[PDB]
Every structure is written in C-alpha cells, then in structure tokens.
Amino acid sequence: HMYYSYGNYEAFARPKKPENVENKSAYLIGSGLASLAAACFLIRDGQMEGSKIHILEELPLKGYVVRGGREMENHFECLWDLFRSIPSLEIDNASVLDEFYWLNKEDPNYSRCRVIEKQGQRLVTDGDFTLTKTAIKEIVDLCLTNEEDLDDVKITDVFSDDFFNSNFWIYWKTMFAFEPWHSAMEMRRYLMRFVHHISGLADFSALKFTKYNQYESLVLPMVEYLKSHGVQFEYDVKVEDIKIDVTTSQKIAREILIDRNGNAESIKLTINDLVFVTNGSITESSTYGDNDTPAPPTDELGGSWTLWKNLARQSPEFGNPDKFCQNIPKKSWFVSATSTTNNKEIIDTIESICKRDPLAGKTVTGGIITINDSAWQMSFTINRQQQFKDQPENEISTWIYALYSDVNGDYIKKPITECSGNEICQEWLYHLGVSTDKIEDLAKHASNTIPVYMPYITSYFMTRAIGDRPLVVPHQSQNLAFIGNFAETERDTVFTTEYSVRTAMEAVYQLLNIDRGIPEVINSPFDLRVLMDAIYELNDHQDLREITKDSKMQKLALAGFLKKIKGTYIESLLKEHKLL
Amino acid sequence: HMYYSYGNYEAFARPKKPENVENKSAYLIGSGLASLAAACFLIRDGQMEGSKIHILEELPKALKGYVVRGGREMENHFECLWDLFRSIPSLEIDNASVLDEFYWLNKEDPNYSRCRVIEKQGQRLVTDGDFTLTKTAIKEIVDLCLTNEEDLDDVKITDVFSDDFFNSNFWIYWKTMFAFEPWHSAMEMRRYLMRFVHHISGLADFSALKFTKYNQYESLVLPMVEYLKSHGVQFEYDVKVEDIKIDVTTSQKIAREILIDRNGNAESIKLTINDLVFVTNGSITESSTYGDNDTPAPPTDELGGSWTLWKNLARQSPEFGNPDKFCQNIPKKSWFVSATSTTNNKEIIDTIESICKRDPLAGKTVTGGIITINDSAWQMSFTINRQQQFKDQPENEISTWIYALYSDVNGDYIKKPITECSGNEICQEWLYHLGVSTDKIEDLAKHASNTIPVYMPYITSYFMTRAIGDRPLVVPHQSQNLAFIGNFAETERDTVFTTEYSVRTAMEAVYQLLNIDRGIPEVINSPFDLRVLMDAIYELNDHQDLREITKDSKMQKLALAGFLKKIKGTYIESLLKEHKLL
Ligand SMILES: CCCCC/C=C/C/C=C/CCCCCCCC(=O)O
Numbered sequence A: 001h002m003y004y005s006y007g008n009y010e011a012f013a014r015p016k017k018p019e020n021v022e023n024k025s026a027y028l029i030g031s032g033l034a035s036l037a038a039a040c041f042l043i044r045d046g047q048m049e050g051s052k053i054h055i056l057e058e059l060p061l062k063g064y065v066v067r068g069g070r071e072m073e074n075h076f077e078c079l080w081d082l083f084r085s086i087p088s089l090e091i092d093n094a095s096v097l098d099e100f101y102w103l104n105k106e107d108p109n110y111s112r113c114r115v116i117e118k119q120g121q122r123l124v125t126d127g128d129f130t131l132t133k134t135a136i137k138e139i140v141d142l143c144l145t146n147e148e149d150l151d152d153v154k155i156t157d158v159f160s161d162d163f164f165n166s167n168f169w170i171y172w173k174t175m176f177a178f179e180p181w182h183s184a185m186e187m188r189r190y191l192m193r194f195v196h197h198i199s200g201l202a203d204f205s206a207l208k209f210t211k212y213n214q215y216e217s218l219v220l221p222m223v224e225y226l227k228s229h230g231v232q233f234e235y236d237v238k239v240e241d242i243k244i245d246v247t248t249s250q251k252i253a254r255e256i257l258i259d260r261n262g263n264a265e266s267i268k269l270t271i272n273d274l275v276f277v278t279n280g281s282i283t284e285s286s287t288y289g290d291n292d293t294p295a296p297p298t299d300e301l302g303g304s305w306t307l308w309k310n311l312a313r314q315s316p317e318f319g320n321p322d323k324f325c326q327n328i329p330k331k332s333w334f335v336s337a338t339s340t341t342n343n344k345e346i347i348d349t350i351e352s353i354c355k356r357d358p359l360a361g362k363t364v365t366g367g368i369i370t371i372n373d374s375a376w377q378m379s380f381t382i383n384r385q386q387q388f389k390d391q392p393e394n395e396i397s398t399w400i401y402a403l404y405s406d407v408n409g410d411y412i413k414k415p416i417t418e419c420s421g422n423e424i425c426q427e428w429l430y431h432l433g434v435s436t437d438k439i440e441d442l443a444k445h446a447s448n449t450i451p452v453y454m455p456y457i458t459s460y461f462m463t464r465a466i467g468d469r470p471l472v473v474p475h476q477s478q479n480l481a482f483i484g485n486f487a488e489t490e491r492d493t494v495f496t497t498e499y500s501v502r503t504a505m506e507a508v509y510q511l512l513n514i515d516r517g518i519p520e521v522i523n524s525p526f527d528l529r530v531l532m533d534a535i536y537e538l539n540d541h542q543d544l545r546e547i548t549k550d551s552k553m554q555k556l557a558l559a560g561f562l563k564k565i566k567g568t569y570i571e572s573l574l575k576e577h578k579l580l
Numbered sequence B: 001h002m003y004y005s006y007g008n009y010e011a012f013a014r015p016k017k018p019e020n021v022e023n024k025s026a027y028l029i030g031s032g033l034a035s036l037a038a039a040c041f042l043i044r045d046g047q048m049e050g051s052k053i054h055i056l057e058e059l060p061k062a063l064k065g066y067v068v069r070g071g072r073e074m075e076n077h078f079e080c081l082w083d084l085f086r087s088i089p090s091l092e093i094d095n096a097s098v099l100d101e102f103y104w105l106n107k108e109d110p111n112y113s114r115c116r117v118i119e120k121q122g123q124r125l126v127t128d129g130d131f132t133l134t135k136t137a138i139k140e141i142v143d144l145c146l147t148n149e150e151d152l153d154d155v156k157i158t159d160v161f162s163d164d165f166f167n168s169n170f171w172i173y174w175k176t177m178f179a180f181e182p183w184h185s186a187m188e189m190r191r192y193l194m195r196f197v198h199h200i201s202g203l204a205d206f207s208a209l210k211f212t213k214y215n216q217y218e219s220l221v222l223p224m225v226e227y228l229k230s231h232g233v234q235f236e237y238d239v240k241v242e243d244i245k246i247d248v249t250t251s252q253k254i255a256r257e258i259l260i261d262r263n264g265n266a267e268s269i270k271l272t273i274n275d276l277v278f279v280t281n282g283s284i285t286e287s288s289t290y291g292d293n294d295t296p297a298p299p300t301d302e303l304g305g306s307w308t309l310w311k312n313l314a315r316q317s318p319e320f321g322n323p324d325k326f327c328q329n330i331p332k333k334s335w336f337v338s339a340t341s342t343t344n345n346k347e348i349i350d351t352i353e354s355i356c357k358r359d360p361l362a363g364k365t366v367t368g369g370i371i372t373i374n375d376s377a378w379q380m381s382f383t384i385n386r387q388q389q390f391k392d393q394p395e396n397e398i399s400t401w402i403y404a405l406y407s408d409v410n411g412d413y414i415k416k417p418i419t420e421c422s423g424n425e426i427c428q429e430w431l432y433h434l435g436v437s438t439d440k441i442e443d444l445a446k447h448a449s450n451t452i453p454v455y456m457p458y459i460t461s462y463f464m465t466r467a468i469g470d471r472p473l474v475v476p477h478q479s480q481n482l483a484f485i486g487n488f489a490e491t492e493r494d495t496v497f498t499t500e501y502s503v504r505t506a507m508e509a510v511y512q513l514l515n516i517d518r519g520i521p522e523v524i525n526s527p528f529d530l531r532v533l534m535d536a537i538y539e540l541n542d543h544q545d546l547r548e549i550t551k552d553s554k555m556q557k558l559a560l561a562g563f564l565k566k567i568k569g570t571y572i573e574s575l576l577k578e579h580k581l582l
C-alpha cells in the first residue's frame, strides 16, 4: 500500500486527498517524535481533520539535562520532507528546514579533536582508521552477508582482533553507541546506510545540528503546527492495552483500554479509527540524580514496554519485546550526565582541547570527544552554546556518557552507576587534564551535574531476528500501525531521528493509501562513485597500486584489469576518485 | 560558483537572498523556454526585482490548420524542470502547481504504447517489444559508453556502430523516438545512453514518457508567463539583438553593450558588471516556413537573428562556441519537414483505433507516443497525443503529428521527396502506410482532412557532430555578467533536445552569475547505480539471465563460473536474483 521513489518529481508533488478521509479519525499513543511526525503527515498529506486527531500523552529538575541521538545528516530524506512544511519558531517566513540549512552553512560542524588519552592529550593517529587488510575484508564480508543470515548474530561474531584494535572501531562504537554484543545486522545496516559519509567519520564533518535542544528545535515547531490545525492533545492518559481482532483476513483494533487521570476508560474504535503505536521506549523508567546523588538503578518496565508485551500476546506478527527489554548486560551503557558550569578554569581547559571558545555560540567540540583510555569508555560533547533559550549566556552544558557501567573509574574508583553527579564530573575533569588538587572543588562547587540512569538506552541495538520488530503496518492490518525505532522497515537505521519520521510517514501513507512515493533510503551503497570513495577511504587514502603492492595475485589481477580499461571512462572515473 | 547535489535536503531548502542582487538587472535574449525559465529563477531564487528583468522578444506582442510540435516528452527524472514547475501556478486547477496538474494527470492516465512499429501498410512488427541486439551490437553499445567523451570529437554514430546494431529493433526505437540520424554526434548518442538508462525497460513501450494535458504553449509557456507578469517582469517586444559588445581581456569577460533594433530604431543598452545578459545561442525553429493542405512548406537555408547573433559573439572569442558546426553543412537528407493532420473523419479515426487499440476521441492516451512505419521510404513516424491538444478545438477532431527522418527520398505512394509535398500529399503517404485503401486516400486527405506542413532547416541542428569547445559553457571562464543557456550551451552529462536541458542551463546560469547558495540537482545518478545497471544488462539482452548471456562465450562462461562460486552465499546473489540476472 506504498511505493518507494527518489528524485525531485515525487519530492515536490502533492498527493491527492485520500478517499473517504473525512470519515476517519486517528489516535497516536504518546508524544515522542514518531507520534508527532505521524500527526503532521495526517494533517498535511492525509488531509485528516485536526479535531479527529488525538495525541494520547501519559504525562500531565535540579539542573539542565541534555540528551543525545539528534545528530542529523543531509540524507535524512523523510525528515526533511516533513520539516520543510513546519514553520520555524525562530525565523519569520521560513521552515524548520530553512533555519537548519542556513545555520549549518554559516557554522558548519567539524571536530578539531576527536580522541584524547593520557589525561587530555590528542591521540597521535587521530584521523586515520588504522584498519588492516583483514579488518577491511571483515567489513566487506559483513555487508555482503544477507540480512536474513544475521538473526541474533553479535558484532563480536563477525569481527576479530584487528578490527577491534582499529581507530575505525573507536570512532564507530562511540559515535553510535555500539557495544560488542550488539546486533551485527544493525551494524551492517549502519555501514551501508552512511557509506557516503565515510570521509567524515573521523572529523564529524557530515554531522548537522539544530540550534537548540530537540524539544525546542523540533518538537515545539511540530506542536505549534498541529495546534494551529486543531489537533487534540490529551494528557494524563495511560494506554494499558489495545484489543485487536486477529482473523483470517484482517487485523482490526477494536478498543483502547486506558487510565484517564485515574479513571479506567475505554475508547471504542471502528475500522475508520486509526491507531499508531510507538512500541517500546529507550527512555522509559529513566531515573535522575543530582550533584550529590546517583541516579538510582532500575529494571522496571513502564507503560510502553508493558503495552508492547500486551500486544505481542495477541499476534506473533506484533513482535517480541523481550528481545529488547530483557537480558540487557549489566556492562551496558545506562548513565549519562549533563554538567553545567560558568567556571573559567573548566571552560578554558575545554578550549585548550577542542581549540574553540565554548562560549562563542558556534561549534565547540563538533560532536563527541572520546577518552580512549578511560575505564568507563567515556565520551563527551558540547554543542553550540547555549542549548536552552533560558540559560545564562556565561554557562556551558556538557553531555557525558559511559559505554561501560560496571567498571571502576580511573580517578573515582567506582562504577559509574554508583556515582553522584559531582563524582562523574570529577572523573571527566581528571581525563581533561585538570590538576588533581583542583578537581574536587571544580566539580562540587563550580559545576552542577545531573546524572540520568536509562535502563533501556541500548535497547534499539540488542541482537534480534527478523520478526522481533512488527512491520509498520502488519499483514492485513486495517487500522493499526507500529512506528518508531522498534518497528520494522527495510534498510534504514534505528537510533536515528530519520527512522522515527520514516516509520511515521510509511504508517500514514499505508493506512490511508496516500498516492505519493515515499523516498527510499538513500541509494549510496549502490552508487559506484560512493563505493570507489569508500575503497579509498577505508584503505587510509591509498590508490589501487599501493593497496595491492604486497599481493602477487592482486598485483597481477590489477595489471590485467588496468590493461583492459586503459584509456577508457573506467580509468577516468578511478582517477577522479583517487584510486588511480 | 555552483555545486551539484541530490536528495530532499537541497531539494526543499531555500537559498538566502544573494548578495547585492538589489543593485542588479537582467536581460534575456532569445525566445523560448530557457529564457522564461531563467527569468523564473531570477524572481524565485535570485529575488531580483521584476522591474529589473527584461525579456527581449523580436516578434510584436500577440478542420482548422492546427500546428503541433513533436518530441516534448517528459520523464520523472527531469530534475531541474520539476524544481521549476512546482513553483508555477496551474492555469487549469485551483491551488495547484503545473507539477501537481501534470503529476495527477499522468497517474490517472499513464502513458504506454500497445503498438510501436508497423510495416506492410498497417501490420504490427512481429518482434515489436524486443530489441533484437546481437552480442556484437551490445558490445558496441558498451564500448561507446566506456569511451571518454573527450575522445569523441566530431565522431559520427556510423563511426562507432556496425551492421548488427543498425539492423536491430533497438535502433528503430532509438533513432525515431529521439530523431537521431546516422551521421549525428556519437558524443550525444553516448550521453543519451547513459542519461536514460533507468528507463531501458520502457524504451519499446514508451511507459516512461509523461505528457502535459495540452500543447507546450498552453501547458508550460502560458503558466510561466502569468507567473512572470504577476511579479512585474518586463516583456519588451519588437526588439532584435544584433550584437553584444564584450570585453574579453586577459582577466575578465564583461558584456558592455547590447546593440539592438527596437521597433525600427537603432539603440544601445549600456551594461555595467551588475547587468546580467542571458543568451540563448542558436535556434532549431529559426527560419521555419509553413505550407498548407495544397502547398508545400518552401525549403529555405536562411540564417535569422539567433544564428547571426551567435556568429557575432563567436567572432569575439572561441570560448563563445562555433555556430557553424550546427547551422552549416546540414545534409540534405536530414529531417526538415513535419506535418499536423487534423480530421473529424470517422474512417481515419477508426483506422487509428484499430492499430493503437484506443479510442482517439476518448481524451486519454491514444498512440502513447510515436508509431514508426519501419518500411517507409521517408522513415516516417506519427503520434496522436491525448485529444484535443488545444483547448478550443472541437471534441470530434484529432490532430496527428507526422515527421520524416529522410527528406530527399521518394515516397512509397506519393513518389516525391517530402520537401516537394503539400499537406494533403503528406497525409496521403501517411494514410497509405496505415493501410487505408488507395482508392480512398486522395479524397480523405484533400476533402476530409486539413494538414499543415512545416519546413525547419535547423530542426536536426542540436545533434550535429561537435567537438568540445563548439558549445560555450553556461558561464564561460572569467565571465562576469554573460551566460549562455539553452540546448547549444555546454554543461556536463545532460542531453540536448530536451526541455530539461533548457531549464538546467537556465538554473545553472542564474545560480552562477548571482552566486546563489543552494545546490543544483545533478543529472540523475542512474548510470552509477548498480541496480539500474543490472536492469540494463537484463533488458539489453532481451530478458536473459547471466547464464544465458554468456553460454556461447568460453571466456565469459569461465569468468561467470568463478564469480558465481564466490557470490553464492551472498547479498550479491540475492541482488542479481532480484534483478532477474540469476
Ligand atoms: C562499505 C562500508 C564502509 C564503511 C562506511 C561507513 C560510514 C560511516 C560514516 C559516518 C559519518 C556519519 C554520518 C551521519 C550519521 C547521522 C546519524 C547518527 O549519527 O546517528
């Protein structure tokens, strides 16, 4: 009930108003980005009446909290389709895309220091991938494995020592938060999804960022758009179950069972009432500490995981939530912290490493800096400052995360899950090279650090088999869709904002049978030019002669290849992409 | 001063207002789509004041003998054209763009042909739909694509193909849908092969073609003119540009004066570096003549204002191109004549229905593109678009467009070259090849139809053999305020004789001269796309998998065996199976 496309014809074309939409309604479970994106497509392309769109939100502090997962790139094809239509709240007569596009041209993101070690020194080989030929072959062999052969396969099952010792793996695992036991299938999707940006892996020159935090820069513009169209925001609503009738030819959602401000209630559905479920949540059951208190660890399942489990009982086609929310290793990333300071000693120390003034209002770290020799495997980033419109102009907020949660720190000799905000700050300042006799005062009195414990922050990447995620529109579903980063669609990568928008758009287009193409995941792994660039970059900027110089059966296979293509367009292409 | 891009980010983003545009002006010289498109980009993306945009036009302000023009087929990957026409309001549908109107129409009534080639006075070619290329012919196709464009200066199509290829159905479809002659530019042939490779599965049945509701004037020009007029653009008529005085120094090229005749008075428009000049150099319609039902269109070799202007620019720098490669030494065999035959006669209309399998008066697709008469001495093809192609035409009428690739060869029924033929004589030759009884053809053409022939001396000129440098760059090296646009300007990869090329060069000219900070969409990346190339191998070999393709080649069979052993477990094998190559 959809088709994929690419190019300007389908991008700029508008769909006809879908048939009979005047008699349809929609319920969106939650107010995360996928739900809001789906509501926007229901308004813009479905032409559904705003009064018939209901966003059901469950909800009705000692410091600023920043989040991750909002790096963008140019080829977020669905996200830019959406946000060209959302008015900016910052610039008159401009969209969110316009604001974003102009900002990232005036102040393009890049890193001047990507990896540090030995308490604040730059890694000597920063910029190189240091991949052996064995490690490169493992990357290629993974990509040439069919996704259907990677059910439950770990990253450690498909790579060996050379790869795990490479700079490539340092950049990769920290920038995307891959753990060694995570899904090889998802790593494969990432390798092919972003291959056009391999020349920007080490310096983050392909990353693009909104001016402010994602709530300010993406959520509030969508909320204003939706409210201007009459969309209903309903608060204090907890969805406990959805009764679905699963017959031989149809799946139809019949009833949403809720608690509305303490009262058990029922929303009766017909086939003409659409339901969009964001199944699962990486932020559910988050806990918070403060400068003096750790965020208390938890394993609680909240409303989102409970709902997906209740749906999973009703059809095997609705997925297997326990693959994602159970058996999460205790080494996994759980804790992040936001450290806020106006202290000049800290800010100057950061400037000495990242080479830019953190208070200037432009790019600061350009993305995460990784402390390669930290026991916690800690990275931190400082976006353009300030990330909050109410924050004082003399303050920065730094985001810190640790890939390993059950390992004693190098300065604070405790696992991060036992650490207060100030203790996490102290470990960080130690790795910046702050003199050890100043660290305690700078962390406790000059900084305010809020730790957050997220039981499910690694859940998107857990090892999975085909079938564990429901299709966006399960087979024969008439009025039920699954959206967000635990729903299934081809090729695209989870833990990205694009995946939220793509699943939303595919859900709305399929359920309403909207007659317009959905942009395919960008065709870069099929593009011979992109692939030539990848060969050059993966081999740390060697041409084919240097690549093959130490292999008899390559050096002669290349000599015979070059003789056949000499003076041809193939040779000119290879010279253009630096392989000859 | 420009960059190429693709994808939705650059598609949907708007450029900042370019620097100092409030102090700039523009002059557009040369009629046609490219000038109008450049004016539209100046308004929309340049944000130039309409009062400062001057469209200079030589003409004065403006069973019938309708005249249609052929070959204005569009496709989905006209990337620049759709960027433009999403911004042009439709004149037919409220609160919709030209793109919207076009998109919905071609979804409701998708174009395709149920009969592409006929022979023996109205019978369908038995192999219609197949390419019938030998392995040798396919190798010649591949070898041309693998030739660097730099090595194809002045090379003819007959220099790079031999007998098998010219005997193929592929060449029938190709030469007639694009109007290639055997002596034409192999360079341009190569560009077409690479440019449209994503549509190879639609070559024979025209399923990739898309058409506007009406003729190009009604459906593209009038919407653009209304857009420009609503923005205050200056349309200046009775202006003939004789020359542009250009300073070509060691460091800059700067247009200094436009020398014109304005309504009979000699005038000079003085230019500063801030006054931009856009020249559509050369013209395929210049010097056209018209006949009628009883009169041939008189042949001519006259050069008019467009070719004379380009000659006057070329003598100021070789970087401004070489018009004589395109407007001189055109072989007398070349296509010159087209005709539009209008009728309400039911016998003719029913004969067309019996061949194309669709009711010509229903308002939908009729022939789905040209039908080629493969055994006609004139190498004639004809098309009937959705009818009627004119808003005010009676609903019981059709207008058929007819052209002949060979102009100096006697016809099969009217035993004269087409250049000696009246409208009714061209109609008679056409009706003969439809299979209408020879006892009926003369009166059907003379008294039941009205056919208007047109003789265009330069209609094949885009494709004349050329060398790199014969076309000026859109913005020549060091040009400050002078651009060349249209289908005799030079830009990478794209194909001339397309409306897309007119819009692309217009966009590139405006973006470079104003330094507009937004990407221009690259020519679509299909020749680099492994999925597209897999499909091309399958289609070029008339739907054979790799085993069948290589079965009679020892070297190829052996290479394939080793490849298959390496890829058997793998994603490469699944991809090849998906594209029917295994
Ligand atoms: C053949 C495979 C070779 C390997 C190709 C790998 C490329 C990796 C490129 C990384 C640059 C970052 C791209 C932007 C990512 C945004 C989403 C996110 O940051 O979450």
Ligand SMILES: CCCCC/C=C/C/C=C\CCCCCCCC(=O)O
Residues within 6 Å of the ligand: B071, B073, B074, B075, B141, B145, B177, B178, B192, B193, B194, B196, B197, B198, B199, B200, B202, B203, B208, B209, B497, B498, B536, B540
């Ligand atoms: C290298 C493989 C050979 C490629 C063969 C491909 C042929 C393309 C077939 C059909 C093209 C249809 C759309 C083109 C419309 C452009 C306008 C015009 O027609 O003016």
